[PDB]
UniProtKB/Swiss-Prot annotation, chain B:
Family annotation (InterPro entries): NA-bd_OB-fold (IPR012340), Ribosomal_uS17 (IPR000266), Ribosomal_uS17_arc/euk (IPR028333), Ribosomal_uS17_CS (IPR019979), Ribosomal_uS17_N (IPR032440)
Mod. after translation: N-terminally acetylated by acetyltransferase NatA.
Keyword field: Acetylation, Cytoplasm, Isopeptide bond, Ribonucleoprotein, Ribosomal protein, RNA-binding, rRNA-binding, Ubl conjugation
GO biological process: maturation of SSU-rRNA from tricistronic rRNA transcript (SSU-rRNA, 5.8S rRNA, LSU-rRNA); ribosomal small subunit assembly; translation
Protein name per its UniProtKB record: Small ribosomal subunit protein uS17A
Protein's organism: Saccharomyces cerevisiae (strain ATCC 204508 / S288c) (Baker's yeast)
Location within or outside the cell: Cytoplasm
UniProtKB/Swiss-Prot annotation, chain C:
UniProt protein name: Protein BFR2
Shown segment, full-protein numbering: 460 to 496 of 534
Note, other: Present with 15400 molecules/cell in log phase SD medium.
Induction, per UniProt: Up-regulated during cold stress and following nutrient replenishment by dilution of cells fron exhausted to fresh minimal medium.
Assigned protein family: Belongs to the AATF family.
Localization per record: Nucleus, Nucleolus
Function: Involved in endoplasmic reticulum to Golgi transport. Involved in a protein-transport step blocked by brefeldin A, which disrupts the Golgi apparatus and its incoming protein flux. May also be involved for mass growth or cell proliferation.
Curated annotation (Swiss-Prot), chain D:
PANTHER family, per database record: 40S RIBOSOMAL PROTEIN S8
Keyword Nucleus attributed: no
The protein's name in its UniProt record: Small ribosomal subunit protein eS8A
Modified residues (Phosphothreonine): 61, 106
Highest taxon listed in the record's lineage: Eukaryota
Functional note: Component of the ribosome, a large ribonucleoprotein complex responsible for the synthesis of proteins in the cell. The small ribosomal subunit (SSU) binds messenger RNAs (mRNAs) and translates the encoded message by selecting cognate aminoacyl-transfer RNA (tRNA) molecules. The large subunit (LSU) contains the ribosomal catalytic site termed the peptidyl transferase center (PTC), which catalyzes the formation of peptide bonds, thereby polymerizing the amino acids delivered by tRNAs into a polypeptide chain.
Note: Present with 15900 molecules/cell in log phase SD medium.
Region (Disordered): 1-30
Lineage: Eukaryota, Fungi, Dikarya, Ascomycota, Saccharomycotina
UniProtKB/Swiss-Prot annotation, chain E:
Descriptive protein name: Small ribosomal subunit protein eS6A
Domain of life: Eukaryota
Position of the Glycyl lysine isopeptide (Lys-Gly) (interchain with G-Cter in ubiquitin) cross-link: 103, 118, 162
Main localization, broad class: cytoplasm
Organism per entry: Saccharomyces cerevisiae (strain ATCC 204508 / S288c) (Baker's yeast)
Statement: the UniProt record of this protein carries the keyword Iron-sulfur: no
Misc note: Present with 66000 molecules/cell in log phase SD medium. There are 2 genes for eS6 in yeast.
Pfam families: Ribosomal_S6e (PF01092)
Described purpose of this protein according to its UniProt entry: Component of the ribosome, a large ribonucleoprotein complex responsible for the synthesis of proteins in the cell. The small ribosomal subunit (SSU) binds messenger RNAs (mRNAs) and translates the encoded message by selecting cognate aminoacyl-transfer RNA (tRNA) molecules. The large subunit (LSU) contains the ribosomal catalytic site termed the peptidyl transferase center (PTC), which catalyzes the formation of peptide bonds, thereby polymerizing the amino acids delivered by tRNAs into a polypeptide chain.
Keyword Ribosomal protein tagged: yes
Length: 229, 123, 37, 166, 167, 338
RNA sequence: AUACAGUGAAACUGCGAAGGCUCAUUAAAUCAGUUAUCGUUUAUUUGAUAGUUCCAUGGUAUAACUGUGGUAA
RNA sequence: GAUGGUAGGAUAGUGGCCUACCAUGGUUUCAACGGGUAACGGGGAAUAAGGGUUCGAUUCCGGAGAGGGAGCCUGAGAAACG
């Protein structure tokens, strides 16, 4: 009854935890019970993960948010107070949620793909992201599928990454879900299979969608740290 | 160009642009045609996907019946039986489409029971 | 003129009521000598 | 009303053997409230959470708009003479959207005499109604959904556009 | 019949089992609210006037004030089909309720000469007759909310002005 | 004791008016008599109970049992109604503002059929059972309840008909057209017999006849107009008439006789705001029934002196005349309260 | 603790039950994925988001409760 | 209402979803429309098992029903297992 992304062992139970509503969707997130209890194993059961949630160790996106099924989606920096645990969780190359450990100056921010820019009411420019941070007043040159950098103390955009040909992009969606390498090709079609294409070890080619891909930095310099093997 | 009652007019001569690589002809920007559901001035907005094919019949007005044959890699009897499709489409003030006439259409806002596509191109 | 004036026979009203024999308390001769003019 | 579904009827291919389903809640067709003239009574019906809908039946105080200056002012209703979305609707004298109804134009007289001084540049076949009192004006607002009677006056082009019709 | 009688201002009420129905026949075909005399229901209570106030009949069914039809009928009350006797009183009432609004010629050792008091005095201030620190804090939090929000809004609108000047 | 309006040396009363100590001396006769802000058409059945009142928004049927003084049900019909009849008890036939016809039963909604053009009036024939329905144009249709067929529709003049009625003791089909002609057809022959023309002396504009009626002697015919002018007719010198201008005169909609109770040769006229009652052979007003709101139509209960209107307000008014007659057996203490 | 002060039958309240059997046989119309809704509803989740003032605190009307009762209920 | 156009009604809104008027359309041999079951079986609908090769994990057979049809009401969600 589980998805593939959670890295959930089959010998666990019968009812799978539906995440509650929140920032991200159901299909692109993992809740805190499947995060803490059975992935990096700070708990043994739902009772004691509710106990540490009542103790309020979790500090995801700089706020506490004491809830069992809180849908932590892409790169919400899970922060735990004891042993200064800073966790940025991204996608691995085979579809799961690889939770990388980072440090404090990297967990002081996150980034987010812009979805739409609106002239909503009363002359106010407007920007949303995958956690829905409706932050005030970016520059006019925010296209769709660019990348804002959230402040995580206040909410303001601090840095901006422009989407164009020659940018380091992350793909979350479809049969390319979780690949990095961002350059063999660029092809913007007019309604589907439109993208920037991603290399491999032998620099192979790949096809995805615009909304299923979003930028993380430059060719060699992302200010996100990434795990390795 | 007024054969019906109830103030045949644009609904706020009027002119807009859907963008996305589809031209608006100059009579459809500034002309006496009303453009109620032709998407260049229109009331509809464009979205979705864009399909292309030749026609079969344009008998009634505001009905463009496209044909659409396409390749599909059949593995069953290992030969390609040829495709055929149909879709009704509202008019545009750019081309009186006759038999032949490969044209393309964009998905928007169901107009009759079966039309979501309106002509944006002729070539 | 599709649904306009279907001259068909309908099922539940075919015996919805029942007639009456004498009907009018007048005679038909009383009709004729009533509106001769 | 009854329905909103294609299941009861045939498509563009001519299919049969329907016998489909018990009709759901979200195929809700309410009764057609033909709005008339009377004393102002609006039924406050519910839908989709607290989505109150104003169903007007006997509305009078039409806010009709002077066209060339855009002055939406308050007046009464007389009757619709031509509306062939139903040619019996004008026989029964109801009040729906896009109908051409007659108005005693006395507050428009008051506004003209108030912001121009003299009484009577404006067209002659509406100057005749400036003199007489009853001018033609077409309803814009929806009393069956928004419960209101707003409209726009007939001024010249739209006037003859309807007067050649009926 | 039994006659429930209530002297309201003294707070007294008592039932009296009156047989001998030609005494009762004064009330007959008189619906609820219409007054009555003591003279044709009794002799020992003369100068008495009773406003009738309903009454359960035999089979216990009540009458509601002012409909018609002194038999039983099936109405819709607080909405379901409840049976209710008509407001008019006839020969087949078990109890009949009465309010005495003027004492006549004889004292009654149940109604007049015996009385009960009320319950308890009032509780509200205006009912006894007939906060300011919260008024400080409400006004202070309101003017502080204004001086926070309406200044911060223009304080990022000026950052929009900086972005527009640099663009 | 309910208050009475002033009149010509006569008394009337209203129950369930717009104004009707009062809470504790309530005089309510029929419980739940109120609709959704208007009223379409009310009529009382042939037997001694079961009056039917058509609805206004989400239109209903509203059968009231007179021997229970309240409501039985409310079948929310599919469309808004204009005209119907009652066919004894439980059956009834209706037609809505669209060109559709409903057949209500004890279970309700026995059928929904249609007519090809928009209809305005319906009557039923007790003899050989064909309902005649008058509509717009050349077309006066039949739906026979014997074998459910259709019949050879009656060819009219140009614009149509506002009201159709058949005579009771002999069957003379009336059809009040627009061009002042009354177009009497014969329910035996399925052909015209006469095309009587209606005249006046004022002649404001080309009026249209809107109300037709007969009575149970079979010799006279009550005629209406779209101007507030009652008319009488006989075969005896059928070209003139006697006329009745009314003091407001918009459109008379209900003209009905008093041919089954005492105080004879009297007739009720009813236009949009007022309903009056006068005597035959002079044309002088017996009484009038001025309410506080307009009137959609009226009806008069048989055997006794009471009237039931359908109006444009929330309740319906009932009007009792203690000089025309008594109050009926189910209202048999109205003469005790007032 | 002479205007409240703990146990607390029976009453208002917040919520509970938050998804269970049998019967007649629908061929991508039952179903699964997918495109879109600047074509639309949305409790709850999450991020955001209010400037019109002439010559010291506002009203009876109902409970629970008492009291008189009816009815086989 | 078959196919579309114009306007209104109703809608949560798109929509012949319904009605007035108008045009005679539309699908099909590149398989329309129609014929049945091992449609108590099938379609990935899904888990797969270190040798069982169509047994071997499950969601769903179709829609209904709370005595029988009908009408109404409540709610973020219903034509309510209450």
């Amino acid at each position: 009854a589980a998805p593939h992304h959670w890295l959930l062992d089959k010998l666990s139970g019968c009812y799978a935890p539906r995440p509650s509503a929140g920032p991200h969707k159901l299909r692109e997130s993992l809740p805190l019970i499947v995060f803490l209890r059975n992935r990096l194993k700070y708990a043994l059961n739902g009772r004691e993960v509710k106990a540490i949630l009542m103790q309020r160790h979790v500090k995801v996106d700089g706020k506490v948010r004491t809830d069992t099924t809180y849908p932590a989606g892409f790169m919400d920096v899970i922060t735990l107070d004891a042993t200064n645990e800073n966790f940025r969780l991204v996608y691995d190359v085979k579809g799961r949620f690889a939770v990388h450990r980072i440090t404090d100056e990297e967990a002081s921010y996150k980034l987010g793909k812009v979805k739409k820019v609106q002239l909503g009411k009363k002359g106010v420019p407007y920007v949303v992201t995958h956690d829905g941070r409706t932050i005030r007043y970016p520059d006019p040159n925010i296209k769709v599928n660019d990348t804002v950098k959230i402040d995580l103390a206040s909410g303001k955009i601090t840095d901006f990454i422009k989407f164009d040909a020659g940018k380091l992009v992350y793909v979350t969606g479809g049969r390319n879900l979780g690949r990095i390498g961002t350059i063999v090709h660029k092809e913007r079609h007019d309604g589907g299979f439109d993208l920037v294409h991603i290399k491999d070890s032998l620099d192979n080619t790949f096809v995805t969608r615009l909304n299923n891909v979003f930028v993380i930095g430059e060719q060699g310099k992302p200010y996100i740290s990434l795990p390795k093997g | 160009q007024s054969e019906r009652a109830f103030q045949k007019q644009p609904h706020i001569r009027w002119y807009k642009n859907a963008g996305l690589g589809f031209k608006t002809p100059k009579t459809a920007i500034e002309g006496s045609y009303i453009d109620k559901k032709c998407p260049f001035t229109g009331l509809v907005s464009i979205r979705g996907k864009i399909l292309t094919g030749t026609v079969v019949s344009t008998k009634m007005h505001r009905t463009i019946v496209i044909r659409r044959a396409y390749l599909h890699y059949i593995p069953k009897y290992n030969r390609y039986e040829k495709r055929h499709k149909n879709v009704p489409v509202h008019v545009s003030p750019a081309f009186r489409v006759q038999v032949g006439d490969i044209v393309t259409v964009g998905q928007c806002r169901p107009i009759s029971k079966t039309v979501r596509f309106n002509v944006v191109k002729v070539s | 003129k599709g649904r306009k004036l279907n001259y068909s026979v309908q099922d539940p009203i075919a015996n919805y009521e029942a007639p009456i024999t004498s009907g009018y308390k007048w005679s038909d001769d009383q009709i004729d000598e009533f509106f001769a003019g | 009303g009854i329905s909103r579904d294609s299941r009861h009827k045939r498509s563009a291919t001519g299919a049969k053997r329907a016998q489909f389903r018990k009709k759901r809640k979200f195929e809700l067709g309410r009764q057609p409230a033909n709005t008339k003239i009377g004393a102002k009574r609006i039924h406050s019906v519910r839908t989709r959470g607290g989505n109150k809908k104003y169903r007007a039946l006997r509305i009078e105080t039409g806010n009709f708009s002077w066209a060339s200056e855009g002055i939406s002012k308050k007046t009464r209703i007389a009757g619709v003479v031509y509306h062939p979305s139903n040619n019996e609707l004008v026989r029964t004298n109801t009040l729906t959207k896009a109908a051409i109804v007659q108005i005693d134009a006395t507050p428009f007289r008051q506004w003209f005499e108030a912001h121009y001084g003299q009484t009577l540049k404006i067209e002659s076949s509406v100057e005749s109604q400036f003199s007489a009192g009853r001018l033609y004006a077409c309803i814009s607002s929806r009393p069956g959904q928004s419960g209101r009677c707003d409209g726009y006056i007939l001024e010249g082009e739209e006037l003859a556009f309807y007067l050649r019709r009926l | 019949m039994k006659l429930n009688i209530s002297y309201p201002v003294n707070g007294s009420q008592k039932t009296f089992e009156i047989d001998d129905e030609h005494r009762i026949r004064v009330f007959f075909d008189k619906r609820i609210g219409q007054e009555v005399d003591g003279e044709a229901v009794g002799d020992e209570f003369k100068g008495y006037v009773f406003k009738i106030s309903g009454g359960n009949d035999k089979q216990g069914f009540p009458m509601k004030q002012g409909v018609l039809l002194p038999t039983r009928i099936k109405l819709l009350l607080t909405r379901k089909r409840k049976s209710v006797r008509g407001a008019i009183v006839g020969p087949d009432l078990a109890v009949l309720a009465l309010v005495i609004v003027k004492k006549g010629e004889q004292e009654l050792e149940g109604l007049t000469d015996t009385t009960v008091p009320k319950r308890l005095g009032p509780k509200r201030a205006n009912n006894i007759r007939k906060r300011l620190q919260r008024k400080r804090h409400q006004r202070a939090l309101k003017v502080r909310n204004a001086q926070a929000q309406r200044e911060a809004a223009a304080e990022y609108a000026q950052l929009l002005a900086k972005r527009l000047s640099e663009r | 004791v309910l208050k009475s309006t002033s009149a010509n040396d006569v008394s009337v009363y209203q129950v369930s008016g717009t104004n009707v100590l009062e809470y504790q001396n309530r005089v309510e006769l029929i419980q739940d008599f109120e609709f959704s802000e208007a009223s379409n058409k009310i009529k009382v059945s042939r037997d001694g109970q079961y009056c039917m009142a058509t609805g206004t928004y989400k239109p209903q049927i509203h059968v009231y049992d007179f021997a229970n003084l309240s409501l039985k049900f409310d079948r929310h019909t599919d469309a808004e109604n204009v005209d119907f009849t009652i066919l004894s008890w439980t059956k009834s036939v209706h037609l809505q503002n669209d060109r559709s016809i409903q057949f209500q039963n004890k279970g309700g909604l026995h059928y929904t059929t249609r007519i090809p053009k928009f209809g305005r009036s319906l009557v039923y024939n007790k003899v050989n059972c064909d309902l005649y329905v008058g509509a717009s144009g050349n077309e006066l249709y039949r739906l026979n309840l014997e074998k459910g067929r259709f019949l050879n529709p009656f060819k009219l003049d140009t614009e149509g008909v506002n009201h159709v009625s058949i005579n009771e003791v002999n069957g003379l089909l009336a059809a009040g057209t627009e061009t002042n002609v009354v177009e009497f057809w014969d329910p035996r022959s399925r052909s015209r017999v006469s095309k009587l023309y209606l005249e006046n002396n004022i002649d404001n504009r080309p009026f249209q006849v809107t109300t037709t009626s007969f009575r149970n002697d079979g010799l006279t015919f009550a005629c209406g107009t779209s101007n507030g002018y009652s008319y009488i007719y006989d075969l005896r010198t059928s070209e003139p008439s006697i006329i009745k201008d009314q003091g407001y005169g918009f459109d008379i909609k209900k003209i009905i006789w008093l041919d089954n109770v005492g105080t004879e040769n009297k007739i009720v006229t009813c236009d949009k705001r007022i309903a009056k009652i006068w005597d035959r052979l002079d044309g002088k007003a017996y009484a009038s029934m001025e309410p506080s709101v307009d009137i959609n139509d009226i009806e008069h209960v048989p055997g006794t002196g009471m009237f039931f209107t359908a109006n444009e307000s929330i309740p319906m008014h009932t009007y009792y005349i203690p000089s025309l007659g008594p109050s009926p057996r189910w209202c048999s203490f109205l003469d005790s309260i007032t």
